[PDB]
Amino acid sequence: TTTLAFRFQGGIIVAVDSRATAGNWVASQTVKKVIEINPFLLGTTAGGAADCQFWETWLGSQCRLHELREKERISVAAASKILSNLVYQYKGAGLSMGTMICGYTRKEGPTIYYVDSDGTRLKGDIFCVGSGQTFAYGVLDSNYKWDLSVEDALYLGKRSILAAAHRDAYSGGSVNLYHVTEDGWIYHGNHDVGELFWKVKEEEGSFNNVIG
Amino acid sequence: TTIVGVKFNNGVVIAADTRSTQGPIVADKNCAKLHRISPKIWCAGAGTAADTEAVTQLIGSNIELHSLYTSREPRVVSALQMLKQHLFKYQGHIGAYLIVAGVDPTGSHLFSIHAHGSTDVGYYLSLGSGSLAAMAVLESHWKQDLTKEEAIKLASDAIQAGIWNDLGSGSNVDVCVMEIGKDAEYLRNYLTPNVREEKQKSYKFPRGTTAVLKESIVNICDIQEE
Amino acid sequence: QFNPYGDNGGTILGIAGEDFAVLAGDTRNITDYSINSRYEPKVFDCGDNIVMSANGFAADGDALVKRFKNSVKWYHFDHNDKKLSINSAARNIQHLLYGKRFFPYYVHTIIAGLDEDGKGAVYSFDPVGSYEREQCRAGGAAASLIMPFLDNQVNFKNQYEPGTNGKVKKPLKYLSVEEVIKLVRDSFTSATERHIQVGDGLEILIVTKDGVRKEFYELKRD
Amino acid sequence: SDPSSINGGIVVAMTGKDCVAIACDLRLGSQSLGVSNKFEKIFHYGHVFLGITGLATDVTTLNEMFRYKTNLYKLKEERAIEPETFTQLVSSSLYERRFGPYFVGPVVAGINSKSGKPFIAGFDLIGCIDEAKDFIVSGTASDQLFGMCESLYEPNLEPEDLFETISQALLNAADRDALSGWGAVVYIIKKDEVVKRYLKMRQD
Amino acid sequence: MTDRYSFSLTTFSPSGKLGQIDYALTAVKQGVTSLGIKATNGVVIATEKKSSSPLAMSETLSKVSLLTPDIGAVYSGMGPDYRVLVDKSRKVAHTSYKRIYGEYPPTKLLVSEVAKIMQEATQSG
Amino acid sequence: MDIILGIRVQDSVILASSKAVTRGISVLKDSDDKTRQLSPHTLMSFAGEAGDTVQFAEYIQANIQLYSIREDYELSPQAVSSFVRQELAKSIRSRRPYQVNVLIGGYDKKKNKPELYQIDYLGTKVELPYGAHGYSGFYTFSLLDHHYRPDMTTEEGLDLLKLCVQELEKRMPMDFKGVIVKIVDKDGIRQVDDF
Amino acid sequence: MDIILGIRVQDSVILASSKAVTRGISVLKDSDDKTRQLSPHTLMSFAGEAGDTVQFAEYIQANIQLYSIREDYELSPQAVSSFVRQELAKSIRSRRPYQVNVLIGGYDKKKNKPELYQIDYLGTKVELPYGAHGYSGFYTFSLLDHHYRPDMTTEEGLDLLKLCVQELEKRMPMDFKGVIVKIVDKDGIRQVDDF
Amino acid sequence: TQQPIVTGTSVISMKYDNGVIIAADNLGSYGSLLRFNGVERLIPVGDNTVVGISGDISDMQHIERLLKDLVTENAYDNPLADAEEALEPSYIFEYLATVMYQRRSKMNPLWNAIIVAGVQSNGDQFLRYVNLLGVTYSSPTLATGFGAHMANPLLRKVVDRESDIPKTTVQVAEEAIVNAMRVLYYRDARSSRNFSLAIIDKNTGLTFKKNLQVENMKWDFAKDIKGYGTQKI
Amino acid sequence: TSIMAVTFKDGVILGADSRTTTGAYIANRVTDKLTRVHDKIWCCRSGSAADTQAIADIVQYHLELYTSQYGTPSTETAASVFKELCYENKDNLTAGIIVAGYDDKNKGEVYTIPLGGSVHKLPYAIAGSGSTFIYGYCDKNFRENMSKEETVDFIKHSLSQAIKWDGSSGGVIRMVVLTAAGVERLIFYPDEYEQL
Amino acid sequence: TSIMAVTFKDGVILGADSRTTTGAYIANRVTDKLTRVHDKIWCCRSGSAADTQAIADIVQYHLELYTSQYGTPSTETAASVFKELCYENKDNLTAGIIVAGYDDKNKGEVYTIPLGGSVHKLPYAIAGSGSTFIYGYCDKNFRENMSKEETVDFIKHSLSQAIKWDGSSGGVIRMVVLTAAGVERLIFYPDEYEQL
């Protein structure tokens, strides 16, 4: 698995791979690792697939009950803390979760919270989680700027998953892109890594080691 | 694996299935489990496949040299003694479980050998994962003074019980008949009750379907003259 | 020590067509190297035009199917005989599975049917309730033998159009119910040859707007 | 931990009409980490071809060993070794390390120079010979290869048809295995010509 | 005890002759005649069964010996030396070939192995 | 020890190796050179278990120096790497295996080409344009995959190497106290004293 | 988390806490503030197991803030430290204990004195002139034993703290990404933004 | 979680044209000790069902009491208790199957393998299996423990599939069962010569046979077998 | 396994069942556990079949070479060779052997060699898993200087009970009679001994 | 421990040794393992002394409360109460109990309850570590409808052998006779039973 999310001028980019494995066996290449909590909030899935799916879907239900009661959009801080407090109750039971709760509100602006099955809750600008996280971090750290355009930021997130998908054996399949704005998230398509790799290799001149 | 041995009037017969497995995966669908120690001494093996093949070739090799040295045709008791002493020395680490059968100047013989070096005598025997299914058939239909034709029928029926009821056994039935005063007749694929049905579709691809990056001629020939 | 789990073998296969869906499974039931039954139905009609199979440990498989069938019945009572849509059934099964997160149903569940637009649908679940709509999914013992074949023959993976040499992919043309059944039968015939736990019989349930139909085929019994 | 699945990779071999084919992926890794996309697993000694999957150090070691042994064979016999003979040599060599084995899955392929008969063979790590008529598979995606080969294969394929069958068997099997892929090579072998083709595949 | 003869008993004389080899050849010369003829579709080897006594059963004394199913041997000279060479030749055909390649050695290579054994008795201690 | 990197550019091979030596709780040294010159145009960096690393490296050095004297000739990098691999392959089935990973950077004077060989403790040899051992590759390979070109100059290679070290210094938990960088080319081996 | 230091000088308490947050193989953050303001003149830094640290710190914060509202009065640092100790002492015999070590730096407005309390996860409380948790003391205490004086100024305390951090940065294997420093005195709590 | 103490071995069974046959030996072993020789392991329920049980005997006796209690409970406020609302084999099995799976799910199983043999109201043959894991399955032949390995192969030669059931008579079916019991006596070290056999026929009803013995055994050939290889005397 | 050897007036008789098990599966129901190491020196084997066969074969070799040089060995000598193998290799053996033989000078003698490798000369000996159940019966019913017919009945009745209670024992009751007259093999089938 | 209960013409007799060991140390050489749960319903105890005493005490309480309400309980009822405790608490008990009693309607009855918690009605029963050695002897020598003197001899001879071979058994042989006439205690010392 490789999942990332970073804050920038235009909001948040979320990018994930699509591979699911049971040991060496590739169970699926078409897995959705972005949970659409609601039209404004996104969550990434790493670690336990069921744990992330179930509890982030549940989180969406809690966020809906909040804004019904309070007549106001839930903050990313409050939403993330509902999830972290929940998994903290289960601490020791064996939940496996590594996620970024991403959102864009008026009072906060674009916000990302890394939430953990150990109970960790961290606000930050750039996060990468999964077996191929180190590969994605390299491309991000060297190319990241706050004043990136929405077009370039989307490509950076795409290219960073591709970097991991190439090197990490347990990452690949396809890349899912999302752009989170104040008015809600916007889906930016599914991109097959097989086709994307050759496209990027030629146009960018990268991956000279690989014969194409 | 299902292997059996059955004594009869003027000799002995051994039989085996033809399935070799890697856990739950079938590696070879027509494996040859009937091995030759000498022209008229054959054996069938179960357990670790490399050990059964290796131990029969080694003893079979030493049996041949012994036969040449003594100017006598090899005896089953010699194969038995050499096999058991070898297997005992390695304390079961050589995972060979064998049914040894054959004819020699002394007469017709049938023995089983276990990996730790213990041996048994019998008129009918079975070994392998399908040995219980096979032994059920043998215990139901075996009698004294079987004919050659009855023993082949019984042996192959015992293998069939393993083929159908044991997941570790399948495919075909191999048989070898060793009669006194005769050449041993190896009957490869004596029964073939598991032919695959014709597929619903042909999966022959159109030429040029596979994407290719480079082509080249490989030089298998030696360095050339001139 | 008491081990509450077991492996009953078996292999299942769900394929979603354009306006239909099939869920197939072999009828062999096993423990270790023994055959329990040559015909023990594994794929079930659960009502509301939904078919289901929970492959792996048969006791948990039977328990889950039984509980889901029960959920369909009570959905009708509580919601004015409303039809349970395949997507709603899928979410319900997630909660049944995740309900035993810390003592799981040791099964790989697949359901098939039609979505609310009438298109073919298959959903695939892990033992603890993570799920996803899929076009093609084999489950169980010989799943690793079947899926690569389906990638190649259903989705036309690694297949390109002759003459172009890797530049143009083979187009993803729609398969008929007759065409799918051929691939299902050949998948199980091949799996039977190379996997010891697969054999005896193949039972296929076909779901269309007209209802649920069954087809049975013999497999090698060795 | 498991030596046969640290580095990953696969080999497949098939027989056709007056021809054999052997193919392999190009990946070498350290578990999850991809290390090399040029690690070829097929070697040849004269006209006899040998594929080797498993622990990469042993793949290298055994190649060097069989080059050693077939070179001395040729000097003494005054002729190149045949596939049937080489198969027995591979088996003998593996079994002599019975209680300290090379963690490999070798695959022999070739045509007998005298009889013209196509020949393939496979081995477990300890030397047991699998002499199949149709096909031999090996590596971390062997289950996948068994599934592909069992359905795609038909007997007496012509060289250029056999290429398509073995290529598709390899590619689609490797795409369902995390530790296989990163390129592929296919050898099409006839009695007195051999064509080597590198395949284009996804690089993840 | 111990074999304290760890030195060569065959050595070069001033003239460059290896005495013990020449004397061995002299012993061969005294031996009964044996011959070999090669045809297009076969080979024949033959010798006289020089019976030491008429009471002796000359059938039990085999001058012509099978080494492998496709290789045979005959000799001239000292019979006991031949008998042990046949035993070694039979074994070496298995240990240094059949147990490695799964087939019997070709004539020239088995001959080479027998030659090696005879060379070593010409140089060893 | 921890991090060892290697990159083969147009006309040279560059090896970067960390300076830190830690013994559990404390960092005992921050200027350790984890490399040995095997021959005038062949350099070997190393990382693995304590003691075994230096013992192995010096053993290889002595053997190559012995060969150089006997034949009055420098072995090719390929020949040296094959010798090293065999020693490690011999070692893995020993009573107590050498726990040592190495990179061999050499300039072949015959072919006029730089060559980088990566060999792990099992005897797993690979020829690469760039390489690493341990976790070093996890942080650096994505950058190298992106920026690397086979026609890079030595100065460009060093810049790409600085970017790799900067990423390591940012995301690695361990303080490896920087790296010693050495360049292997047609003129021999030299150390970049400012990095 | 890793390193947390504390030093009580003449008229204030200084707490230094590392910025790194490492979750396994990667450093996820290099600007983490491992502290919570319990009351206007009482600050608590913390280090221990992930999740438990922040959960505990915020739980204590909420309880002290509740007390402040109910009584319209700020509890003394001593009173706060005793409350915190009891919670940890209660925790150690629980089903799943809080794995959290804390330093409580406070200025007692009644006595006009700075106070530093060190409490480990077992509920082991000690009042000290300077303190630490984990391995931090092993590197720093010899320097503090040497240089510390009870009549030190805040500026002198910061200089001695810099020397402690420099020794940590030299001899610790882990990169803790520097420290956030905060001062607690009669005027309240403030952060030293340049360190 | 426990371990079985006093145990019963194979239960074997098969369908024939008009009903089902089930059999099990009368032994209650105590490890390798053949402790109790008069244990009835076939327990009839009404006149249409016979439950055969293997494994832990103390749990068998508990199950025996549950079935006895089930008959009592069914008769309460039930005028048709001996007619339309009598206990069916399918009702009895489903009840046991529920209990077995519930008990395994509480990590406190009934350490048994059970075969419920009977004939339904409509004359249909009922034969289904359940064990300590709650695993269930049906087949023309069913057997537990050693029976699964040795009896099934022999019984499957008579009824190999569903279509062979109408072709199989009660005499042929009983003959096969009795032979299988002999084979198990030869080869199962935890078996006894004495056994019970029950036939449930849709026409002639329940026929329960006690105190049967394995007979027509072949042992004479043993006299000729000498040594373990080379020994002649 | 149920094995015993009993001395009587005219010599000694060895007795044994014929069951060999692998777990609960009877691998051989017609085993011959009475094995010959010399003309009138036999033994009963219990424990590892591989071990006891290997031992017996070595003993037979030793006594054959003994006979070639020094003439017929005593039963005591045979027991000593068994002991030497069992005692020196105690760490790698699971063998319980009863040695029985007939001299003309010493007449019938019985030696038992349990796991440890110790030797015990006895009037009669019992061993194997089934022997536990007949210690009481054998002690109450054994007499010295019994007749051939009485000793056969004693062994038959004893092993009948051992077989009845021990699942590891069963099949036929084999016996070998050692006297001045020679060597006589006896066999008794289930239908005969079960009704006793 | 060596314990048994034997039915005969006039009723039933319980028999037991008196040895209780902690490892190889005899903690009590004069133990009374024959314990009373009702006037003419007794039991023999084997296994954990703490467990079997606790069980017996609870049974005695249950049968005392039964008697207050419903009159004298049957031997079957007593065995059922023993079984219920042993079966339901099988995970935490190490108890092997033989229940013996005398009704006028049913006469002498014997029930054995092994580790599992199962119940087995028998003509006679043997149990405890020493019972293994007398399965053969007891099976051969037991007859139904024996006299009092014959049954006392049968138990005395049986337990004598069990004691002889089992180190865990020993001391005196205690017996309790249950008949219409009443309850009679018997004791037999080493000098008496060892010479048998």
Ligand SMILES: [Mg+2]
């Ligand atoms: Mg042994």
Ligand SMILES: [Mg+2]
């Ligand atoms: Mg892959």
Ligand SMILES: [Mg+2]
């Ligand atoms: Mg990848």
Ligand SMILES: [Mg+2]
């Ligand atoms: Mg490497």
Ligand SMILES: [Mg+2]
């Ligand atoms: Mg028995």
